Nucleic acid binder design. Structure first.
Ligand SMILES: Nc1ncnc2c1ncn2[C@@H]1O[C@H](COP(=O)(O)OP(=O)(O)OP(=O)(O)O)[C@@H](O)[C@H]1O
Length: 447
DNA sequence: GCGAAAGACACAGATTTCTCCTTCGCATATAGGGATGCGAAGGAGAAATCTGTGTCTTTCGCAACCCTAAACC
RNA sequence: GCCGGGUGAUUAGCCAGGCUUAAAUUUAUUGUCCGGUUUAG
């Protein structure tokens, strides 16, 4: 996060070196026109784009029930299996704790995050403090972070390590400063308290990508904003459906009708030539513009993408519609041959509706430049995936989650043997309780 | 080890709104009188949301340094 | 078998292309003007 006389050493191509070369070039040139076209910025952007977010390893010492262990996480999927009271939620809490400081530093530097509560330290007599360590590896680049808290009543101090995460956050802020539509990583957490929001604002107008960074946890009001966001998309599509798109539509149907008329009357060149020429010319002219750059128009495509994505997980339904009533809007489904309502669904269908809708909203908001926003990077944590699901749905949820979002790392903890029948052996970790050296401890043995 | 300037953590309490609780007023299907059932407002008393204050965490461009080359702390 | 590490030797030489060898899931070369170590004047 500073400028240097560009120490040389051996030659390499690390992202850090490109970061410091751009900073060195910054202190000389003042005009922004040269800066926006310099080859150093192109090198930095190209290097940053091909890197894939990935948490490498984690270690927990003397936190809650866990005394000491180290875990290695896969880059696409990992599942923790155990019984009650075996510290399944402890690991997810530790990961969210270390991920909050990175979340905080992106919005503004030197901003605090989340600490350790005084009741989370172990209750043993011989303990003195608790610590958490982590590591993030983007391509060659490696960063580390340590969070620690001393037991209340002690007279010896311990502090945190925060140089790596501040250095990493500075790169993201610098890139965002010179790129119009730079993307950001995704971090989310679905705790066990998501069943309360199962169908239980001064005219919000401006939408930005920094509103999804308010919190790392999905809770309470996020459902309400989803509804407000969805109707905004619908109105945007309606505006695109009208105006000049209707003019070419007016020609096209008439040309088709004229061709149909030419087909009739015993085929009357002449009429056929005129109809064919007019149809070809109008269609070619309309298609040439293609609303600027085809998929660049978004509008209708995004709304259909989110609707079809939601309908992917509920095969028993037909369509979902938004209807304006006398004084409020409604969401109408159709199951079988009867129209339903969002408040007349079962608990299980509501859970899937909220989970998928929130995930799609976050992915769409954080990647405004990608043609298909559902291919972004990030990490998602889910606890007790088998809530309010019958065994038929328990065996196919996992492969669908990884099928729809193929570039997101997943961490999942489960409770039942139904899901274990559909997971590879390389991404299964089993917790156990054994006594070593006269002291009880927890181990993970399934590499 | 830690300047100034903003957040996190823990504990109160206050307040508007909603919801439970009398009191009687129709009503209507059984020829008037009596009975079971439900609708209408006051008047509670409960509960989610917000706001207040007091205790610590991070970590400075911090009177006061040498001018030959490489590595480590 | 695959991959990831070691490096003597070659090349208008921090390229490039050749020949060897090593293994539980298991390194990512760091602080000067002080300190001791190497060289030189
Ligand atoms: N401070 C503590 N000292 C000792 N043990 C603790 C402490 N805090 C929690 N525990 C232990 O944690 C155990 C439960 O841990 P945890 O909630 O992580 O497990 P889980 O049942 O797998 O999780 P979940 O049901 O929330 O998904 C309890 O049995 C308790 O003994």
């Amino acid at each position: 996060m500073w400028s240097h006389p560009q120490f040389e050493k051996i030659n390499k191509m690390n992202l850090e070196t490109c970061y410091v070369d751009f900073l060195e070039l910054e202190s000389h040139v003042i005009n922004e026109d040269y800066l926006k076209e310099s080859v150093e910025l192109q090198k930095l952007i190209s290097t940053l784009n091909e890197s894939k977010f990935h948490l490498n390893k984690i270690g927990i010492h003397d936190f809650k029930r866990i005394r000491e262990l180290q875990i290695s996480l896969e880059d696409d999927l990992t599942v923790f299996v155990g019984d009650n009271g075996f510290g399944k939620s402890t690991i997810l809490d530790a990961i969210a704790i270390v991920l909050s400081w990175l979340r905080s530093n992106i919005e503004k530097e030197s901003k605090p995050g989340t600490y350790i509560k005084s009741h989370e330290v172990n209750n043993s007599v011989d303990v003195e403090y608790a610590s958490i360590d982590a590591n993030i590896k983007l391509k060659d680049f490696n960063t580390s972070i340590l969070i620690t808290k001393a037991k209340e009543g002690a007279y010896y101090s311990r502090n945190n390590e925060l140089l790596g995460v501040k250095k990493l956050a500075s790169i993201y802020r610098l890139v965002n400063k010179y790129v119009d539509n730079a993307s950001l990583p995704l971090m989310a957490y679905y705790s066990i308290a998501r069943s309360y929001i199962g169908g239980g604002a001064k005219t919000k107008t401006v939408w930005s990508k920094f509103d999804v960074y308010d919190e790392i946890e999905f809770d309470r009001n996020d459902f309400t904003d989803f509804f407000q966001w969805l109707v905004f998309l619908h109105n945007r599509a309606s505006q695109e459906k009208l105006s000049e798109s209707q003019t070419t539509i007016n020609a096209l149907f008439s040309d088709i009708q004229s061709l149909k008329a030419t087909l009739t009357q015993l085929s009357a060149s002449t009429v056929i030539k005129g109809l064919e020429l007019s149809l070809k010319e109008k269609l070619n002219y309309m298609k040439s513009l293609q609303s600027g750059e085809h998929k660049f128009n978004n509008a209708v495509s995004l709304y259909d993408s989110v609707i079809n994505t939601i309908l992917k997980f509920l095969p028993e339904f037909q369509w979902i519609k938004l209807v304006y009533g006398d004084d409020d809007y409604k969401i109408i489904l159709k199951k079988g041959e009867v129209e339903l309502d969002i408040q007349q669904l079962s608990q299980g269908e509501k859970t899937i509706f909220t989970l998928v809708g929130d995930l799609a909203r976050r992915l769409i908001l954080l990647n405004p430049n990608l043609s298909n926003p559902l291919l972004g990077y990030g990490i998602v944590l889910i606890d007790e995936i088998d809530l309010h699901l019958h065994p038929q749905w328990q065996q196919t949820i996992i492969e669908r989650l990884t099928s729809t979002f193929p570039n997101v790392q997943f961490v999942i903890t489960t409770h039942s043997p139904q899901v274990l029948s559909t997971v590879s052996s390389r991404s299964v970790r089993i917790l156990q309780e054994v006594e070593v050296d006269g002291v009880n401890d927890l181990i993970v043995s399934h590499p």
